[PDB]
Amino acid sequence: GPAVMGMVRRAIPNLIAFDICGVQPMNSPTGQVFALRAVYGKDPVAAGAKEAFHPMYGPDAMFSGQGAAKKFPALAASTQTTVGDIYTHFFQETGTVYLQASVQVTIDAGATDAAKLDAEIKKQMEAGALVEIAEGMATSIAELQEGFNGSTDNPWNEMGFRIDKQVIEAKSRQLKAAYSIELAQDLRAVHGMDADAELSGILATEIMLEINREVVDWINYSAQVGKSGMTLTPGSKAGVFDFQDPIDIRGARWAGESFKALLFQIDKEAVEIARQTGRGEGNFIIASRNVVNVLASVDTGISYAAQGLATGFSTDTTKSVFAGVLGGKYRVYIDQYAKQDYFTVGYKGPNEMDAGIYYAPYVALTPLRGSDPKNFQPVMGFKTRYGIGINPFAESAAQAPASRIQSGMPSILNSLGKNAYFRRVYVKGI
Amino acid sequence: AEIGGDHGYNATNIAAGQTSGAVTQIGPAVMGMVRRAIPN
Amino acid sequence: KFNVLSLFAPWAKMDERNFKDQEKEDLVSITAPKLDDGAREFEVSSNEAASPYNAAFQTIFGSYEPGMKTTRELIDTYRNLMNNYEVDNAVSEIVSDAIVYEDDTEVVALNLDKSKFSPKIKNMMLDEFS
């Protein structure tokens, strides 16, 4: 014992648990969730079937109304309108819209993709060429619906719904220590270590860390990219928020007024999420430690301007990972392993099935012990099994899935960059 | 008029809960189980 | 069954009645054997789709019979201890105190000083006791 100076080891980082996702404790593997989709057009399950309700699409304002009697001409690239008539178009976003023509004009003959057509139509709308319109059906038509008085081809529009579902499956993970007797004995003689228990700790720890890290990555993987579309400033850099570029800060200088610009965008992204999910404004953010340092140093309340030290929210990743609540509104977590600099926002409801992302544990941290008689060295390890999944409707773009059944597990096709509950923001310039 | 439709007698589809109509099923309720009796 | 051992036919009926009473009891949601002492219990588990009682049968049969063998070794020893000096008397003295009986004394006697259906029964019970 030549003046032993004690010893060191690394600390274990904390986790965000499942604070921002579903937890679905399971008592069996492979559970299932189903859903009802209000639908109309006399066949709940069909190509082209239309959903009665959707966060991103307007309703068919003339479905029970005049559209019952007549079809409306569709808008299409290169066609010319007739003043006073009404044209129909289903937009990629904002859905069914009926537009009365105030003028006789053409629409972007050079348009190709629907996105280009939608853009010109939007311009014609702004221009006052095309105006939103709806009306009920002339009563003289309604009078004979269902073939009265010798009439024909006059059914009422019908509605119903389609129930379908998705299922999940649990994947697992296991690790062993495979250690030796002699090492454990020496450790007992050096620090008084058990050298099995420490390993048990390490293995269990690693498993838990991986799972939690996996959830965060799935959040990032499925989240839509923000500062885009409906939340985009047209002169911006598309998905990334800077401090070195006046476009994102409305010309700000003077950090006391500049930093608030981010808070503004955060609200916009949180609101759009509600627009995407139909449930509510995002209520949680996870972000790089650099982002949080900024948040904690700016007065996030409404005031003239203000700057100081980063004391507003815990900023460490050594005690916790939970920084605090932003404005008293969003739960702020720190992405202690962020690859660059950024921040994801999202919404999780009181209903465990209302989360977008779900974790559903079935088996966890089962210890295993024994020894191999060939050399009698010990073997120890741990096993976990759970499975994760995604919300039906998380994509939101589609009103319904193929074949009335799908995996509820994430995949590229199922959710990469699609999840209505979360949005990504890249951050630079801090 | 929306319908329930029905199973194709395909035990797989039945077990899954697939039918020809507007609504999928949870899956068949399980009535119980029988273990072959043990020889004396 | 056909009750081949006709020897105890009336006793079998007595056990059937008591057994039926237990079947009609609400003594469920019990993990414990509900036993303290006496007869040796074991998991002859049946009337369910697993039939584990077969292992229990085979255990009793295949291992016949350390329970009674041990019992013999103990009893045989007990007698052999009693055969020596002092042990001999200790037993005698205890037995004598447990049952003291002398000229015109009282024997173990049923004392029915608690409520009964009738004094007539009290006498019948004492006569049977005798």
DSSP string, A63-114: TTTGGGT---PBP-TT-B--TT-EEEEE-SSEEEEEEEESS--B--TT--SH
CA distances in angstroms from A245 to A241, A248, A251, A288, A342, listed in the order given: 8, 6, 8, 20, 16
Q: Give the separation between CA A25 and CA A39, rounded to whole angstroms.
A: 32
For residue A162, give the chain B residue with the closest CA.
Answer: B22
Closest in B18, B22, B26 to A161, CB measured: B22
Closest in B18, B23, B26 to A405, CB measured: B18
Chains that touch A (3 or more CB pairs under 8 A): B
* Neighbouring-strand partners of residue A166: A33, A406
Identify the helix (H) or strand (E) that includes residue A202.
Answer: helix A197-222
Q: Give the separation between CA A102 and CA B22, rounded to whole angstroms.
A: 42
Q: Give the separation between CA C18 and CA A176, rounded to whole angstroms.
A: 56
Q: Give the separation between CA A425 and CA A225, rounded to whole angstroms.
A: 7
Closest in B1, B2, B24 to A164, CB measured: B24
**CA angle centred on A129, ends A126 and A134, rounded to 5°:** 90
First to last CA, chain A: 50
> A379: which DSSP letter?
E
Q: Give the separation between CA A367 and CA A382, rounded to whole angstroms.
A: 4
Q: Residues of chain B whose C-beta is under 8 A from some C-beta in C?
A: 33-35, 38
CA distances in angstroms from A110 to A77, A107, A114, A127, listed in the order given: 7, 9, 12, 19
Contact call for residues B20 and B27 (beta carbons, < 8 A): no
List own/partner pairs for A279-283 with CB under 8 A and 24 or more apart. A279/A347, A279/A349, A279/A354, A280/A347, A280/A349, A281/A329, A281/A347, A282/A330, A282/A345, A282/A346, A282/A347, A282/A422, A282/A423, A283/A329, A283/A330, A283/A331, A283/A346, A283/A347, A283/A348
Nearest one of A172, A85, A75, A128 to A383, comparing CA atoms? A172
Structure tokens at C47: 């009337």
At A59, phi and psi to the nearest 5?
-70, 155
Residues in A touching B1 (Cβ below 8 Å): 42, 158, 160
For chain C, what is the radius of gyration of the CA atoms? 23
Nearest one of A388, A392, A339, A430 to A23, comparing CA atoms? A388
Tell if the CB–CB gap between C51 and B33 is shorter than 8 Å. Answer: no
At A205, phi and psi to the nearest 5?
-60, -50
Q: Give the separation between CA A259 and CA A301, rounded to whole angstroms.
A: 12
**Resolution limit, Å:** 4.5
For residue B22, give the chain A residue with the closest CA.
Answer: A162
Structure tokens at C82: 């009693």
Given its phi and psi angles, is residue A86 left (phi above 0), alpha (psi -120 to 50 degrees) or beta? beta
> A9: which DSSP letter?
-
Q: State the CB neighbour count (10 A cutoff) for residue A418.
A: 21
For residue B34, give the chain C residue with the closest CA.
Answer: C49
Nearest one of A83, A57, A85, A81 to A71, comparing CA atoms? A85
Side-chain-side CA neighbours of residue C55 (13 Å): 6
* Neighbouring-strand partners of residue A423: A224, A345
**CA angle centred on A319, ends A306 and A342, rounded to 5°:** 55
Tell if the CB–CB gap between B26 and A32 is shorter than 8 Å. Answer: yes
Q: Give the separation between CA A215 and CA A337, rounded to whole angstroms.
A: 13
Structure tokens at C63: 């291992």
Q: Give the separation between CA A89 and CA A103, rounded to whole angstroms.
A: 17
Contact call for residues A135 and A66 (beta carbons, < 8 A): yes
Which amino acid is residue A134, in one-letter code?
A
**CA angle centred on A17, ends A14 and A23, rounded to 5°:** 170
Contact call for residues A216 and A402 (beta carbons, < 8 A): no
Place of tokens 């105190």: C97
Residues in B touching A44 (Cβ below 8 Å): 2, 22
> A298: which DSSP letter?
B
**CA angle centred on C26, ends C24 and C28, rounded to 5°:** 120
Q: Give the separation between CA A51 and CA A43, rounded to whole angstroms.
A: 11
Nearest one of A208, A122, A136, A195 to A384, comparing CA atoms? A208
Which amino acid is residue C38, in one-letter code?
G
Contact call for residues A101 and A83 (beta carbons, < 8 A): yes
Q: Give the separation between CA A406 and CA A141, rounded to whole angstroms.
A: 43
Q: Give the separation between CA A338 and CA B24, rounded to whole angstroms.
A: 42
Tell if the CB–CB gap between B23 and A405 is shorter than 8 Å. Answer: no
Contact call for residues A89 and A121 (beta carbons, < 8 A): yes
> A370: which DSSP letter?
E
At A343, phi and psi to the nearest 5?
180, 130
Q: Give the separation between CA A112 and CA A116, rounded to whole angstroms.
A: 6
> A13: which DSSP letter?
P
Helix-, strand-, coil-residue percentages of chain B, each rounded to 5: 15, 0, 80
Contact call for residues A228 and A269 (beta carbons, < 8 A): no
Nearest one of A335, A93, A352 to A219, comparing CA atoms? A335
Q: Give the separation between CA A73 and CA A85, rounded to whole angstroms.
A: 9
Query: Which structural technique was applied?
Result: cryo-EM
For residue C57, give the chain B residue with the closest CA.
Answer: B40
Residue A22 C-alpha, separation from nearest chain B C-alpha, in angstroms: 21
First to last CA, chain C: 38
Residue C28 C-alpha, separation from nearest chain B C-alpha, in angstroms: 22
Tell if the CB–CB gap between B2 and A34 is shorter than 8 Å. Answer: no
Q: SS3 for A221?
A: helix
Tell if the CB–CB gap between C49 and B35 is shorter than 8 Å. Answer: yes
> A228: which DSSP letter?
S
Side-chain-side CA neighbours of residue A360 (13 Å): 27
CB-based contacts of A333: which residues, under 8 Å, 6+ apart? A16, A19, A20, A284, A285, A286, A287, A321, A322, A323
CB-based contacts of A342: which residues, under 8 Å, 6+ apart? A287, A288, A291, A335, A424, A425, A426, A427
Structure tokens at A394: 């998380």
Q: Give the separation between CA A86 and CA A160, rounded to whole angstroms.
A: 27
List, in sequence order, the alpha helices (H) in chain C. Answer: 9-23, 53-62, 66-82, 87-98, 119-129
Nearest one of A419, A410, A397, A406 to A164, comparing CA atoms? A406
| Interface residue of B33, B34, B38, B40 to substitute, partner C, most C CBs within 10 Å | B38
* Neighbouring-strand partners of residue A286: A333, A344
Nearest one of A348, A34, A58, A9 to A166, comparing CA atoms? A34
Nearest one of A47, A51, A128, A58 to A88, comparing CA atoms? A58
Q: SS3 for A56?
A: coil
Identify the helix (H) or strand (E) that includes residue B15.
Answer: helix B11-16
Structure tokens at A278: 């139909």
Q: Give the separation between CA A89 and CA C112, rounded to whole angstroms.
A: 102
Task: Check whether the bond before C65 is cis (ω within 30° of 0).
Answer: yes
Q: Give the separation between CA A275 and CA A268, rounded to whole angstroms.
A: 10
Q: Are chains A and C in touch, 3+ Cβ pairs below 8 Å?
A: no
Q: How far is CA B24 from the centre of its chain?
A: 11
> A307: which DSSP letter?
B
CB-based contacts of C27: which residues, under 8 Å, 6+ apart? C34
For residue C53, give the chain B residue with the closest CA.
Answer: B38
CB-based contacts of A92: which residues, under 8 Å, 6+ apart? A114, A115, A118
Contact call for residues A201 and A167 (beta carbons, < 8 A): no
